[model samples]
Target chain A: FQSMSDITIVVDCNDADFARDICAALQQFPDVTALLPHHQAARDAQYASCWFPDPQLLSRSPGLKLIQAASAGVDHLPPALFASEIPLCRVIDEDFRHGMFEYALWSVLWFQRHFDRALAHQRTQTWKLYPQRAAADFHIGIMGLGEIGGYIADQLARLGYRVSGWSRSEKQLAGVTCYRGEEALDHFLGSLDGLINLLPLTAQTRGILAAPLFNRLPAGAVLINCGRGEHMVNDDVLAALESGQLAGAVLDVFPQEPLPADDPLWRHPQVVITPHMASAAPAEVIARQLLENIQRQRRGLPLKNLVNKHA
Target chain B: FQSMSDITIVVDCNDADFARDICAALQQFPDVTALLPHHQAARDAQYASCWFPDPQLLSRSPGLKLIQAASAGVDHLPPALFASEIPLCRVIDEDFRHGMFEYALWSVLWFQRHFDRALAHQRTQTWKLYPQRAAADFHIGIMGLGEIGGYIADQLARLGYRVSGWSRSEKQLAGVTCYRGEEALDHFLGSLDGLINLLPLTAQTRGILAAPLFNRLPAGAVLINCGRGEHMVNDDVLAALESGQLAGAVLDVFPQEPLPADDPLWRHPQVVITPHMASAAPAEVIARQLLENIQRQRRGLPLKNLVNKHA
Candidate 1:
């Protein structure tokens, strides 16, 4: 019988603390070798586990057979990783799904209940009551109908918000009105009281939340952007708010993260800026999924959650 | 055809504008006479529409057959209303249910997602990420499992919160862990991360949310008081917050109207104070329900949402 080939895995997560935790977790697997990027053995490792890995370093490692992403989105990966024929896989954690549902649900309700008005009234000791609207009266649109977006749509629909979802192709979700392709975009935008952006970053989606989009939505509609920051043009968002085309915006991501301290977004009364934390996969959960996928690859089984490079 | 007998309706809603609006809405029924509390015709009215009517004035009206409350809670009405044989009906608007759901859901999520932390980080230009727990991990307890409370429980449970509800008597609801009577309070308190007070104000529930009840909750549990101001003791709530037995509070109702400007709660860092507007019955909606019930009474039919006198 042929001896099982030696398996070496290298991790290069951007955060040192996160990298250490993941490496420590991998120690339970004795049959395989796991190393941080700096380890000498990592140079010949056949597997690269990373978040935003260095393309130059990845190309230099000649034996690399696969690239495993630490997060769900592979948008951060270097172009070289996509160009390479090696199979690429992304983490598909149930934890991420739950986290996103919480974030989106919380943000949507925050606007619907007029908590902003409540807080403002609290400051001035003004006890005036704003007109309250029911969830059924408020129509919310989701930009992408993928797993995360569909889950959010389902939750909102169950709670009785008139929900609509849009995607490149038609998708049907119980209790949600579906809109497909470029033709349906205007109709989706026209009726929404709120819009949630969950579209994955792609050539088509880049700069999608711009002036043309803001104009289509009814005046005073709110924007909740939890997707990639590149989807929005900063100036256009500010203009929309200034012109009163959009009443407010809840932004969890930005073009420059840690969003420069002096950024105007921080000072805007109508804008709520959260760190890019709409959802975070637990390190232990990610480590477990990574180990399982590695095992699957070793056994010649098709990997789960393989990304479509061209799409 | 027999001519419709003249039925007199009296309105005394505290606010002149609100009384006028209700009177205007009632003008369509030509067979009925609708008048404000001061009108001579109101003196002999068979039906009284009120929000905390003057007990002396109500006593003088000998022809009164029913008291139609302008809101869902009849707690503010003089004891005479409950003591009298005439049936009292509270507004049971679907809009009110949706409004409270929005309020309770938003308040629960505000605490669950650590929005307080996010806002603080924004002030200091900090980008630190806080540890997150999923909706499934949070156990939220509803103190009263009636219509509004049951609806909130259903929505949270559907969204995957480990929801438990306590009522004075046993109540059955899908996906909810039901706790009943004083004996089960401890068990319910032990498991809840959040407690929502929706109990109606009565001799039994008055001052119910005090030190003894606060001490039973797990450490760092949050309080959301949306039921009635009389149900809570301000000093006890303040003490609980000080001792860290309660992590935070969202108070929509208070011991005093407009909550005295100098009240400590106004400046309390851990408190979110909103006007007593968590759910307001739309005037038009209330007017329609009141008129329908009055007509039902003339036909000798039973009234809806009549508060149990003994309970």
Candidate 2:
């Protein structure tokens, strides 16, 4: 009972006020330490450190039973934290699935309509209009069939795009062509006229969107990535656009956030750059999600989305 | 045979060159024109004039049996022509159907994908920044059950819009909610987040898109018109948009073609204007279609699309 009641969960995040909100949710345990008022309380012996951990400093929390974070991507987690036996779970950010689906659905739809010509006609003040291609005329491919990617595929399919998605493992969503493992990669690429990447940052996925593989896509295909940026090497993307292997690419998450004002990606007419915010878990929504996680913990059930430690 | 081969038609269009092109199409008829240069040879006393009693005009030609013209609308033709038992037929340009279908498809797809935000993003060179609505959420309503309107309804249905259509005549496009006549108009308007007008100019349809009727539309319902502009009074459309009952309107053909340099519709932020060129038919395609009429006449069959004196 002591171990379960006193279970110290650390959150490595910048919002201390949010940590207090989480502790307030465990109000059933009156003795639970929110620990905000005093110096010893902030770094007290029985406390769990709820802040981003630098490698050596993380060992200070000796009684930590689990680590919960406010964000979805765990790429920033200190490597040493993985060595610890504590389990890790992400907040799942209600915002991530919805926000990514929106941006990806938008990208595919714009290309299908050839909307730029409509704008150009407006600027030139000309009545010249071209016929638009039908949605069933082209295929859409989404990489990394995670929660967000799957939802986006469902949306595009609803719009009558011949939509397919591929992931490291077998996945399924109604009206979506879900393929799994390496064997389905080529079949996936060959079928797409526009491809969206929402895969995570992992060893197998890193640099997978490079030129040779990208060129293997149907000529004049477009790319849209709202996933981890380091997974795509910028130079290869630029080359793909220039050579017409890719007609265009809409990138939301980049290797570097803010992407520096002077980056050449800004100059490419075919490449659209957006500050890396494709998915944001608004503070209030993140708070509610974390509160739900605590309820799951109190039940002594296996927590949802347990991180794969070996990976 | 003399009256049939010398089927000289008088066309009082603004362009002499276009009139000459129509005469050249008669030349493509081999012996249809009896090798007349324009209608000059048909004016000879030995030849019966295609113009009735007047050798130089339509009222003079006893040989007059057809009044073929380059334009699609029959409004320019005099009532006496249909009353003369000439069996008047007007070319219903197939190009207009294709053009209208393209615009309707573009509008539905644009709304589905949120093209406006994507256009704004292109200017800022930003990435992964905002959430967009999905296609499955879009609802489209097409007003009119004619060839163009029905085709657009089918196209939208294929694209996963919650498609509904209103028409004077009952229509049954597969997967579309066919709201017949004025009685079912409200049900069609209620379900729409997007509305398209392709109604022909008629007493029942005139001013149908005005303020009170427009109010019946769901809030933020966008309007797209590729039909006659008189059916949608400018003042009423502006008022509806001002009242926020409409999100936007895309107008392709206006009551006045050039639409005046100072017209308020040109400057409305929610309105997109294209000169009255939405249903512009290609000269060559219409010419070929007219040739088919000649073949129909040669077979002693009634021509397709004989216009009534009142219509």
Candidate 3:
């Protein structure tokens, strides 16, 4: 049996310092020990919270009990980790869903109401009004229907948008027309005036935003990506923009970022760019969630978000 | 009895050609006579649509029956017009209300979610995150609760914002804390993280958004003005911005505009400038309303919006 004196944990992520940020949030608590990626422990870490952990690191732990994902998407972890008999739970945060709603709603208005045109014209000191389109007239399609995406879809539909959603499995949301599986995608893509990518990163979804997909959308459709950086084919998007197949793009992630200075997207007049955080949990919020799971493990309760079959 | 053969209409505005735009919409219909300013008819005009009409224009038309405002507010007309027996009706379109919602909701998110900060940072190739505040954590107050203002207030409150509203008369909206009369102004002003002006311009409300009002708000509160230009004291707002008593301003209307290029607001980093058409019915929509009222007048029916003691 694992020792109950103080359950130790590891914070290992792809080489970014957000791991350190999570470790710092854990510092204020007593009787809970957290270790950084390269930091040493006596090999007794009872659980590991990860954002793309090295496959061998968790496997080498002598007493590893379960694995946790630091954010909403768990596709960053290796399949080998899931193949083992460990439970993996990701954060389910209402505030994070609302945060994404704020960003997505703002971006929706930018395209639907022509704020993008107005801002560009403002630079030349020209005051002009673009032909305003009513929200009900614009069709906005969401590419994922998980917790966060589904909430935004319902909210947009309630706000008088013609909202459509697509996912791997069938789902239902009032006022949203849903498309399921691979067969229905092109039909879903054909009707959108704007496409917002909130799809979780997965083997099936990698490089899914290439020319094949862009070619299926209506001419001059707008794209707002809040999904992982790897899902997009950057070159394909730029070429499509150049041809005016996509009239506007609001990118909150990139294949490489802080994007290299030479990147053409930096200077594209129609592209709205931001760093990769469209929705995120502050470290303190994650820490509280981590503590709850740790307590549950001690009481021998079946853990909160187990991913594997416990096989 | 007047001649039923033809109804003469005059489109007289201060100087801009929105009057002409309105005339063009009416042009497509037969037997509806629309005339421009300084262009004459043989003097049996029935009614006029106005935007700051020459004080004597409508009063000089002997056969005039009812006055129709070309847009939402009738404050542009001289008070003497109301003192007469004529009826005045303003255009009320549901599309116009939703359009304002699109603009106001966009501006609200720009402040609440720090997109303004993110956009500025992106310009420099810098990537950083600001502290995120949830919508519930931000208190937004609307300063009028008539048709348009009340709709926006309820919508924002339903989206999980802490919404408060104030009006000269008592009013109630579910989820909005209502403040009524002159006595509650300070309390309403004091609680807001953002203040939105949608008030009608009246003798009591003109120049209401000045330093005295800014001083009552907590430091760093933002202001969004969709009210008439005269409702603001521009010099005082600039001073409040300079001292950080107010952090941002989104001004859609100005006292004089296309806002001259030499104006300080053109170059002010924290100010957002929009051409004065924040919420407007398209010419076609307005033409339909005018046709409805003109037919109503022919039947000797009571006019829709009377301004004198009949109101």
Candidate 4:
């Protein structure tokens, strides 16, 4: 613990929104040397590689005792990020939880009531009535009962859905049936009418949304992946739908985004494609979170939400 | 109280779902000479008219002693129906109540949290994250504390919304602020972030969603009209939205349905249009409701949910 010296706010060439917000937040610190936006830049920003700040360029910042990221995911960071003396902290603030909770709840509600069909009727100007069951009747399963997943479970369960969760380790969220470890996943899957993947991407988690994994779910199960899209194998999801193993898939993230017009996923009748957007760490709050860590480092207190080396 | 030699199942020409279900329910009684669908051409099968069965048509079936409707809106019943020698009875069914309740609860939830905007983020592939506040902060004003409204109030209150209700008369649905009469509506509106309309359509209730009434609600109110579209004045609603009197609106019933494509309502950015879908009564349960009424009549028991004659 020492007075702030070298600091680095990691900027992926992508995500101008993140870079701009983070820079603005950090600039509020009078003594802190921070990056900033160019005044003449277009309001509409790009997320291509050309926009990314160079990681090699970041390493040269002499006062870089800490590296703050604009996203919760640390997987995209270079392997040397862990090797560096500085501590890397990820943002796990309420933004991720609340935003994910809102989106996940909508997915479960859509499945419970078939809102897509209702929207379709609106599009065609048809007034066909369809039958829908109550939320209390659906087996809504949440994966990774962490801060965000637990919040989602609490919301759905209180709304009267039959809610349950599965995790690699044991945990309890009130009214949610907790299924712990990889061993218990299938038992949870067979019973779920809808499955939500909120698992953090790890060596053990990548490609977790494969065909065999989806096959474990009940016939006609609705799958929602608002978690890491990199963990999903797209063809497996499409094949599962074609084979009738899953009724539908709602994907918020994908292996590739700005998903090309020709991308088969967008055209799949059973698939709903949303570009990777569930939550964002509010730059204001995220800046405060980073500042607190800076202060914590000064006070020799533990840094918040330290990136899991194992993850 | 005589056993009927003939029966009538009056219905509208285009409402096949209602006519079919009612006929199917009545067919369970083998001894009852109920009308058949295709039997309009049959000389002897004229005991009832599930389609276009008015009092004049009922009189043609000289042996008829009972007049029944396959639908819930009894205001359309021919005047002679009440004066006929046959007793006038309407189905106090759960189907519409359930449908309306489902719709009311969904609308309340949507209004309480600006969910439509959150969902739209997906279609546009934008990640400008806006946080949704918790339901505990929402004070929901539910109009019509009857079957559908009461059920929704109970459901939302249980889920932790501050729920208030106003009916023509006061009655408690535990944990709801049950207010009585026209005076109470203003009080209810003043405290609400969201309002649910589940009231019946009546002469006194026409055009209730006018400027004066809309003005009673707190600034940035959200209106949920699943009750009747005629209850709302379209121009006033537009003005209210433009003036920021209402933050948003979810209109399920429009005065004219299958809302013509040219209707200005379709273009309102702050409005959500759902084809009047509230949870519908399950036919079996509604039939059971009718059966209970029939049993009550046989026992000289007073009916339940009798329409307010003054209304």
Index of the highest-lDDT prediction: 1
Clashing pairs in 1: none
Q: Which consecutive 10 residues in model 4 chain B have the weakest lDDT in total?
A: B42-51
Off by over 4 Å in 4: A1-14, A22-96, A171-186, A239-246, A256-270, A302-308, B1-15, B18-147, B150-196, B209-223, B232-250, B254-275, B292-311
Candidate 3 lDDT score at position B155: 93
Global lDDT of each model? 0.83, 0.64, 0.82, 0.66
Q: What digit string (tens of lDDT, one per residue) describes model 3 on residues A1-311?
A: 74544757888777367777777887668777788646557266877878878878655675777678888777778777777766677777888888898899999998998878767766777888666688889999999998888999999998899999998888999899999998898999999999999987777899999899999999999999998888899899899999999999999987676778778787788888877667777777777788788789879887765554332
On the 0 to 100 scale, the lDDT of residue A32 in model 2 is: 44
**lDDT over C-alpha atoms for residue A159 of model 2:** 63
How well does model 3 score by local distance difference test? 0.82
Runs in model 1 deviating more than 4 A are A1-8, A15-17, A28-34, B1-5, B14-21, B28-33
Order of models, best DockQ first: 1, 3, 4, 2
- Candidate 3 residue lDDT tens string, B178-279: 999889999999989999999988879999999989999999999999998889998999999999999898889878867786778766677878777577
Query: How well docked is model 3, in DockQ terms?
Result: 0.58
Q: How accurate is candidate 1 locally (lDDT)?
A: 0.83
Q: Rank order by lDDT, top first? A: 1, 3, 4, 2
Q: Give DockQ for candidates 1 onward, in order.
A: 0.59, 0.16, 0.58, 0.18
lDDT of 4 at A75: 60
Where is the poorest 10-residue window by lDDT in model 1 chain B?
Answer: B51-60
Write one digit per residue (lDDT tens) for candidate 2, span A40-133. 3333323333334445434555555556555666665677767777766666754456666656755675465554444445654554445435
